[PDB]
Structures are given as C-alpha cells and as structure tokens.
Amino acid sequence: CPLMVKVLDAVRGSPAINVAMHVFRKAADDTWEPFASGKTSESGELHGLTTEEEFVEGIYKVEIDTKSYWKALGISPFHEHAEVVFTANDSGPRRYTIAALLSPYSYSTTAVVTN
Amino acid sequence: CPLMVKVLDAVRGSPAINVAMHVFRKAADDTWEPFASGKTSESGELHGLTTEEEFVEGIYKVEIDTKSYWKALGISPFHEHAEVVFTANDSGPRRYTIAALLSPYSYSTTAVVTN
Ligand SMILES: CCc1oc2ccccc2c1C(=O)c1cc(I)c(O)c(I)c1
Numbered sequence: 001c002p003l004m005v006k007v008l009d010a011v012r013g014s015p016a017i018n019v020a021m022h023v024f025r026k027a028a029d030d031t032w033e034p035f036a037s038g039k040t041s042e043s044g045e046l047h048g049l050t051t052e053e054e055f056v057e058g059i060y061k062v063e064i065d066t067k068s069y070w071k072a073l074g075i076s077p078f079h080e081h082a083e084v085v086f087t088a089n090d091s092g093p094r095r096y097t098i099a100a101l102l103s104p105y106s107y108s109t110t111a112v113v114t115n
Numbered sequence: 116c117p118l119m120v121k122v123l124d125a126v127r128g129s130p131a132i133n134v135a136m137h138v139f140r141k142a143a144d145d146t147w148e149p150f151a152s153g154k155t156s157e158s159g160e161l162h163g164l165t166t167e168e169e170f171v172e173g174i175y176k177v178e179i180d181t182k183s184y185w186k187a188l189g190i191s192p193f194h195e196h197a198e199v200v201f202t203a204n205d206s207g208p209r210r211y212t213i214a215a216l217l218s219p220y221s222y223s224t225t226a227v228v229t230n
C-alpha cells in the first residue's frame with residue numbers, strides 16, 4: 001500500500017467515516033487526470049487506492065470532500081474540500097500516508113513518508 | 116479589506132515573509148480564473164487583494180507557493196503548494212482572514228470570519 005489517506009474529526013474526537021475523496025495525477029499536457037478514488041472506512045482510513053507499479057513519479061492531488069462530510073452532520077463548513085498536492089516518488093518509491101484533521105472552519109494535513 | 120491572508124512559519128516561529136500566492140475564482144465552466152495575487156509582508160500578511168464590490172459570492176481558491184518558501188530556506192518540503200478552497204457567502208457584513216501555518220511536511224489553515 002504505497003498511498004493511504006487517514007481522516008480524523010477534531011470536533012467529535014473520532015475517525016471521520018465515509019469521507020469521499022478523489023486522487024488526480026498531473027498529465028504531460030499539465031491537466032489533472034483521474035487517478036483513483038474511494039471513501040474512508042470505520043477507522044477513518046482509505047487503503048488500496050493504487051499499487052507500486054501504477055504509482056509512478058508525478059504530481060498528485062488528493063481532493064478530500066470535507067464539505068459533504070460536515071453537511072451530513074448538519075454543519076455548514078467553510079472549505080469546499082481539503083486539497084493536498086505533492087510530488088511523489090521523485091527519489092524512487094516511497095510509502096505515503098496523507099492525514100487530515102478536520103474542523104468546520106479549519107483543517108490540518110500532514111504526510112508520513114517512509115522507505 | 117474584505118479578504119486578507121496571513122502566513123506563519125512553525126519551524127522558525129515567525130511570520131512567513133515574502134510568500135507568493137494567487138487567488139482564483141471558480142468560473143461557469145469549472146475553470147479557475149485569476150482574481151488577485153501578491154506576496155506576504157514582513158508581518159506575514161497580504162492585504163488589499165480585493166474590494167467589497169468585486170468580492171461577490173462564489174467559490175474561491177487561494178494557492179500559496181509554500182514550496183518556493185521552503186526552498187529559499189534550504190528546507191526540503193512535501194507539498195507543491197498549499198490550497199485553500201472556500202465558498203464566500205453573504206450572511207451579514209463579513210470580513211475574511213484566511214490563515215496558514217506552515218511546516219515542511221504539514222500545514223494548517225483556518226478562517227477567521229468577522230463582522
Ligand atoms: C493533520 C493530521 C494530524 O493532525 C494531528 C494533530 C496532532 C497529532 C497528529 C495529527 C495528525 C496526524 O497526521 C495523524 C494522526 C494520527 I491518530 C495518525 O495515526 C497519523 I499516521 C497521523
């Protein structure tokens with residue numbers, strides 16, 4: 001699992017469950033091409049998005065649909081989505097965990113990158 | 116000043132000075148059109164982006180060039196940029212501060228919306 005995404009809820013102190021997200025990869029013409037998508041599980045984690053063969057060098061974007069998550073909880077959030085953009089595998093393959101911690105008007109994102 | 120941006124540095128404990136950013140407004144065809152841009156001041160703030168007349172309801176994206184900021188300090192960053200995508204809503208007189216707190220492998224953003 002070279003790319004995993006973990007989402008937490010800072011209001012409830014819990015994993016953020018059923019959070020949809022889309023992953024895009026920048027193509028040679030500099031447009032965003034669909035790469036993978038999914039939703040977080042009961043643990044707030046989304047596994048199995050890609051494989052080591054498919055996950056080549058490039059610039060990737062993870063668009064986390066935080067708006068839908070908050071609205072289903074009756075909260076009108078500030079952000080449309082949390083957007084994480086990064087170069088992957090520039091120095092050879094890595095494993096990437098993209099984490100997001102969500103509040104209605106704020107979010108943080110970090111990456112844990114291992115060899 | 117209906118819209119202001121402030122950027123802090125979590126490694127140095129200081130405003131993030133000379134950080135470039137562009138603001139985009141979502142167009143009818145889902146494209147991002149340039150709206151405003153600038154560089155943060157010695158206080159890490161960017162003022163005068165727009166006016167109340169021009170800053171109408173809609174979806175806006177602030178794209179913060181965090182990669183160049185870290186490169187200039189000699190620090191290897193994870194993100195290509197920090198993106199903040201939000202809907203501007205007319206519900207009372209509102210002034211928006213978009214803030215970002217930067218680390219090489221992590222960032223946080225929040226909105227301080229006041230009257
Ligand atoms: C931005 C997301 C985030 O905010 C934080 C605030 C305080 C401490 C950690 C975090 C954190 C994490 O990244 C994170 C949390 C867990 I639990 C975890 O298992 C993994 I891997 C990553």
Ligand SMILES: CCc1oc2ccccc2c1C(=O)c1cc(I)c(O)c(I)c1
Nearest residue numbers: 121123212214215216223224225226227
């Ligand atoms: C993500 C932005 C952010 O990260 C933080 C981490 C800890 C405490 C506060 C913050 C903070 C702020 O909102 C913020 C900070 C300052 I100083 C400020 O002048 C204004 I307006 C806003």
